[PDB]
Scaffold this motif. Structure first.
Motif, PDB file in Angstrom:
ATOM      1  N   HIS A   1       0.856  -1.182   0.000  1.00 35.45           N
ATOM      2  CA  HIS A   1       0.000   0.000   0.000  1.00 35.45           C
ATOM      3  C   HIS A   1       0.892   1.232   0.000  1.00 35.45           C
ATOM      4  CE1 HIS A   1      -3.405   2.645   0.735  1.00 35.45           C
ATOM      5  NE2 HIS A   1      -2.699   3.206   1.699  1.00 35.45           N
ATOM      6  N   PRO A   2       1.233   1.776  -1.160  1.00 43.24           N
ATOM      7  CA  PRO A   2       2.093   2.958  -1.202  1.00 43.24           C
ATOM      8  C   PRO A   2       1.308   4.217  -0.864  1.00 43.24           C
ATOM      9  CG  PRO A   2       1.464   2.355  -3.405  1.00 43.24           C
ATOM     10  CD  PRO A   2       0.888   1.297  -2.508  1.00 43.24           C
ATOM     11  N   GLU A   3       2.049   5.305  -0.678  1.00 50.18           N
ATOM     12  CA  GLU A   3       1.438   6.609  -0.456  1.00 50.18           C
ATOM     13  C   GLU A   3       2.409   7.684  -0.920  1.00 50.18           C
ATOM     14  OE1 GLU A   3       0.434   6.947   3.614  1.00 50.18           O
ATOM     15  OE2 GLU A   3       2.495   6.900   4.357  1.00 50.18           O
ATOM     16  N   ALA A   4       1.871   8.882  -1.112  1.00 46.13           N
ATOM     17  CA  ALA A   4       2.549   9.945  -1.833  1.00 46.13           C
ATOM     18  C   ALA A   4       3.609  10.631  -0.976  1.00 46.13           C
ATOM     19  CB  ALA A   4       1.540  10.982  -2.315  1.00 46.13           C
ATOM     20  N   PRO A   5       4.680  11.111  -1.599  1.00 47.26           N
ATOM     21  CA  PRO A   5       5.582  12.035  -0.913  1.00 47.26           C
ATOM     22  C   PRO A   5       5.016  13.443  -0.921  1.00 47.26           C
ATOM     23  CG  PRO A   5       6.389  11.614  -3.109  1.00 47.26           C
ATOM     24  CD  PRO A   5       5.199  10.714  -2.920  1.00 47.26           C
ATOM     25  N   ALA A   6       5.429  14.223   0.073  1.00 44.19           N
ATOM     26  CA  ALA A   6       4.893  15.562   0.263  1.00 44.19           C
ATOM     27  C   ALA A   6       5.872  16.362   1.110  1.00 44.19           C
ATOM     28  CB  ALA A   6       3.517  15.512   0.941  1.00 44.19           C
ATOM     29  N   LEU A   7       6.095  17.632   0.757  1.00 45.86           N
ATOM     30  CA  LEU A   7       5.561  18.282  -0.439  1.00 45.86           C
ATOM     31  C   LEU A   7       6.685  18.500  -1.429  1.00 45.86           C
ATOM     32  CD1 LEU A   7       3.188  20.912   1.178  1.00 45.86           C
ATOM     33  CD2 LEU A   7       2.515  18.939  -0.178  1.00 45.86           C
ATOM     34  N   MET A   8       6.350  18.602  -2.712  1.00 49.92           N
ATOM     35  CA  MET A   8       7.377  18.638  -3.742  1.00 49.92           C
ATOM     36  C   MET A   8       8.071  19.993  -3.782  1.00 49.92           C
ATOM     37  SD  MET A   8       7.436  15.663  -4.863  1.00 49.92           S
ATOM     38  CE  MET A   8       8.528  15.899  -6.254  1.00 49.92           C
ATOM     39  N   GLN A   9       9.361  19.967  -4.112  1.00 53.38           N
ATOM     40  CA  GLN A   9      10.138  21.195  -4.206  1.00 53.38           C
ATOM     41  C   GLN A   9       9.717  21.991  -5.432  1.00 53.38           C
ATOM     42  OE1 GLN A   9      14.358  20.592  -4.350  1.00 53.38           O
ATOM     43  NE2 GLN A   9      14.834  22.786  -4.385  1.00 53.38           N
ATOM     44  N   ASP A  10       9.413  23.276  -5.210  1.00 53.65           N
ATOM     45  CA  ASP A  10       8.945  24.218  -6.237  1.00 53.65           C
ATOM     46  C   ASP A  10       7.684  23.715  -6.933  1.00 53.65           C
ATOM     47  OD1 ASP A  10      10.967  26.023  -5.675  1.00 53.65           O
ATOM     48  OD2 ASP A  10      12.328  25.143  -7.160  1.00 53.65           O
ATOM     49  N   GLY A  11       6.789  23.090  -6.163  1.00 49.68           N
ATOM     50  CA  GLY A  11       5.567  22.528  -6.718  1.00 49.68           C
ATOM     51  C   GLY A  11       4.592  23.556  -7.250  1.00 49.68           C
ATOM     52  N   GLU A  12       4.767  24.824  -6.878  1.00 46.32           N
ATOM     53  CA  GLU A  12       3.924  25.886  -7.409  1.00 46.32           C
ATOM     54  C   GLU A  12       4.188  26.124  -8.891  1.00 46.32           C
ATOM     55  OE1 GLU A  12       4.424  29.493  -5.299  1.00 46.32           O
ATOM     56  OE2 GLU A  12       2.880  30.590  -6.408  1.00 46.32           O
ATOM     57  N   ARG A  13       5.458  26.160  -9.293  1.00 45.39           N
ATOM     58  CA  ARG A  13       5.807  26.549 -10.653  1.00 45.39           C
ATOM     59  C   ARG A  13       5.692  25.416 -11.661  1.00 45.39           C
ATOM     60  NH1 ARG A  13      12.081  27.938  -9.905  1.00 45.39           N
ATOM     61  NH2 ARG A  13      11.204  28.665  -7.916  1.00 45.39           N
ATOM     62  N   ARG A  14       5.641  24.163 -11.218  1.00 42.77           N
ATOM     63  CA  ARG A  14       5.857  23.040 -12.116  1.00 42.77           C
ATOM     64  C   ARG A  14       4.723  22.034 -12.007  1.00 42.77           C
ATOM     65  NH1 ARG A  14       7.991  18.397  -9.848  1.00 42.77           N
ATOM     66  NH2 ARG A  14       9.006  17.822 -11.823  1.00 42.77           N
ATOM     67  N   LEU A  15       4.690  21.125 -12.979  1.00 49.14           N
ATOM     68  CA  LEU A  15       3.656  20.098 -13.087  1.00 49.14           C
ATOM     69  C   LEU A  15       4.327  18.736 -13.100  1.00 49.14           C
ATOM     70  CD1 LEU A  15       1.491  21.858 -15.738  1.00 49.14           C
ATOM     71  CD2 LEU A  15       1.046  21.665 -13.286  1.00 49.14           C
ATOM     72  N   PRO A  16       4.344  18.017 -11.977  1.00 44.71           N
ATOM     73  CA  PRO A  16       5.113  16.763 -11.935  1.00 44.71           C
ATOM     74  C   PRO A  16       4.469  15.628 -12.708  1.00 44.71           C
ATOM     75  CG  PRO A  16       3.994  17.124  -9.854  1.00 44.71           C
ATOM     76  CD  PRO A  16       3.743  18.352 -10.676  1.00 44.71           C
ATOM     77  N   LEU A  17       3.135  15.544 -12.707  1.00 45.22           N
ATOM     78  CA  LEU A  17       2.451  14.501 -13.461  1.00 45.22           C
ATOM     79  C   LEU A  17       2.603  14.698 -14.960  1.00 45.22           C
ATOM     80  CD1 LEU A  17      -0.772  14.209 -11.314  1.00 45.22           C
ATOM     81  CD2 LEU A  17       1.084  12.555 -11.506  1.00 45.22           C
ATOM     82  N   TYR A  18       2.683  15.949 -15.412  1.00 41.72           N
ATOM     83  CA  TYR A  18       2.878  16.204 -16.831  1.00 41.72           C
ATOM     84  C   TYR A  18       4.288  15.843 -17.272  1.00 41.72           C
ATOM     85  CZ  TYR A  18       3.306  18.715 -21.235  1.00 41.72           C
ATOM     86  OH  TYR A  18       3.538  19.051 -22.542  1.00 41.72           O
ATOM     87  N   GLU A  19       5.285  16.109 -16.429  1.00 43.26           N
ATOM     88  CA  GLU A  19       6.662  15.846 -16.831  1.00 43.26           C
ATOM     89  C   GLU A  19       6.974  14.360 -16.837  1.00 43.26           C
ATOM     90  OE1 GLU A  19       9.145  18.142 -14.296  1.00 43.26           O
ATOM     91  OE2 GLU A  19       8.703  20.044 -15.304  1.00 43.26           O
ATOM     92  N   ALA A  20       6.268  13.574 -16.025  1.00 38.70           N
ATOM     93  CA  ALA A  20       6.505  12.135 -16.010  1.00 38.70           C
ATOM     94  C   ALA A  20       5.954  11.471 -17.264  1.00 38.70           C
ATOM     95  CB  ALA A  20       5.889  11.514 -14.759  1.00 38.70           C
ATOM     96  N   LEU A  21       4.873  12.015 -17.820  1.00 37.66           N
ATOM     97  CA  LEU A  21       4.253  11.398 -18.987  1.00 37.66           C
ATOM     98  C   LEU A  21       5.066  11.641 -20.248  1.00 37.66           C
ATOM     99  CD1 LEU A  21       0.568  12.320 -18.251  1.00 37.66           C
ATOM    100  CD2 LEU A  21       1.572  10.049 -18.141  1.00 37.66           C
ATOM    101  N   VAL A  22       5.573  12.863 -20.421  1.00 33.51           N
ATOM    102  CA  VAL A  22       6.274  13.212 -21.651  1.00 33.51           C
ATOM    103  C   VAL A  22       7.618  12.502 -21.707  1.00 33.51           C
ATOM    104  CG1 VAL A  22       7.062  15.131 -23.075  1.00 33.51           C
ATOM    105  CG2 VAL A  22       5.069  15.406 -21.620  1.00 33.51           C
TER     106      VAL A  22
END
Lengths: 52, 49, 310
Positions: free
Chosen positions: C247-268
């Motif tokens: 049962h995994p769970e998310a890390p929090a909180l991401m560095q500079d998460g305001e400016r960037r989109l982590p889910l978008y960068e993982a897909l491309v």
């Protein structure tokens, strides 16, 4: 980086052998009654030099 | 007996099993003497003799 | 592509036993690997003897890397003096159409891209021999593009068993049961295939992927409700048995998460390495099929019209 020595390895090869390890069914999961019974795994990735 | 309930309680948690004796959970007892004898007793102290 | 196209000429040596001359006229539509785009070559350059590596005969799995180093070309017409062929990476003809005869067990459908495979399957192993010139000709098998990605996946996964002191032979397509002939694989080219995997395997893992890993408990709950989600796991995936334990769970909180989109960068990054990898092991699907008098099925043993695929 993350905090050092935080990351564990995968017990997926290990826990699959023992039948006595607790499992979850499709009706179990997303309930917190079994979220604590399962294995907890928290990956970190903030120190990764990845291909981009 | 309690043997109907005792063979049952080893079933899984992900398939529910709710048994309420008189609207109360079953509590078990080994024996009863003349002195205890608990005739008009409430909530489900059951016996296994 | 030129206005006339570009047509190479493969000259034939003069010493010819007459039964080997009729054997070449049955090679009307085949696929020929050229090393260059030189205009004039020889049959010794085309044949399997020059197609070997230095001192070492290549196996079936090692023959794929030899293909992508060379240039696939298609014989147009067999002449008495020479053989005229058109390359595929070069713009193919003046008209944009070539005939290709199926030396393949499987029929073809319209629009499907064609990749090409070495002679792999049992029984139908057919190599033309030119015994007057002492030559051997191994011609590749044109196949539909999801089939070629299966066969490469069956061969590469077989070689990983050889590094670990059952079973993986049987394929299925259009209900046909068919296995493949292979005995050994050289330890050299398997490492070249495997290193091409794991570098592209690693380069999909980015910071957004661990957020996607938190949705593993969602899918195993969702496969209870819809059979379309049950069409994913198939009981042979890791993720069905992986969801039963971890049962995994998310890390929090991401560095500079305001400016960037982590889910978008993982897909491309995933679309450029893992979704690319069907091109990286085999060669590219350069050719698809466009019948003009509309034949939905091109039968095994027949020609077909041929148009490039981007």
């Amino acid at each position: 980086p993350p905090a050092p020595n935080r990351n564990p390895d995968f017990p997926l090869a290990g826990l699959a052998a023992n039948p006595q390890t607790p499992r979850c069914s499709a009706g179990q999961v997303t309930n917190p009654q079994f979220a604590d019974r399962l294995y907890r795994w928290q990956p970190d990735l903030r120190g990764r030099p990845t291909a981009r | 007996d309690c043997d109907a309930l005792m063979r049952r309680a080893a079933l899984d948690r992900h398939r529910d099993c709710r048994v309420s004796a008189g609207g109360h959970d079953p509590v078990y007892a080994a024996a009863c003497n003349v002195a205890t004898a608990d005739f008009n007793r409430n909530d489900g102290q059951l016996l296994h003799n | 592509m030129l206005a006339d196209g570009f047509e190479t000429d493969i000259a034939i040596p003069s010493g010819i036993s007459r039964p080997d001359a009729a054997a070449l006229q049955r090679c009307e539509g085949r696929v020929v690997f050229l090393p260059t785009i030189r205009r004039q070559l020889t049959l010794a350059d085309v044949a399997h003897e020059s197609f070997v590596s230095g001192g070492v005969s290549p196996d079936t799995l090692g023959l794929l890397l030899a293909y992508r180093r060379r240039f696939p070309a298609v014989i147009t017409r067999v002449l008495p003096t020479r053989i005229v062929a058109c390359p595929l990476d070069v713009g193919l003809t003046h008209a944009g159409t070539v005939n290709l005869r199926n030396t393949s067990p499987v029929d073809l459908c319209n629009g499907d891209p064609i990749s090409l495979v070495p002679p792999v399957f049992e029984g139908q192993a057919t190599d033309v021999r030119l015994d007057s010139l002492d030559l051997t000709l191994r011609f590749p098998v044109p196949l539909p593009s999801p089939l070629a990605r299966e066969i490469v996946a069956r061969l590469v996964a077989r070689g990983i068993r050889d590094l670990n002191p059952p079973d993986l032979n049987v394929l299925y397509y259009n209900g046909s049961r068919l296995s493949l002939l292979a005995d050994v694989q050289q330890l050299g080219p398997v490492n070249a295939e495997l290193r091409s995997l794991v570098l592209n395997m690693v380069y999909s893992i980015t910071e957004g992927t661990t957020i996607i890993l938190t949705l593993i408990p969602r899918l195993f709950a969702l496969s209870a409700q819809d059979g379309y989600v049950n069409a994913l796991l198939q009981m042979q995936s890791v993720t069905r048995e992986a969801a039963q334990l971890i049962h995994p769970e998310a890390p929090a909180l991401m560095q500079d998460g305001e400016r960037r989109l982590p889910l978008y960068e993982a897909l491309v990054a995933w679309l450029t390495h893992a979704g690319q990898l069907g091109d990286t092991l085999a060669l590219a699907p350069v050719v698809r099929v466009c019948t003009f008098d509309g034949a939905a099925v091109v039968r095994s043993g027949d020609m077909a019209p041929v148009i490039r695929y981007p």
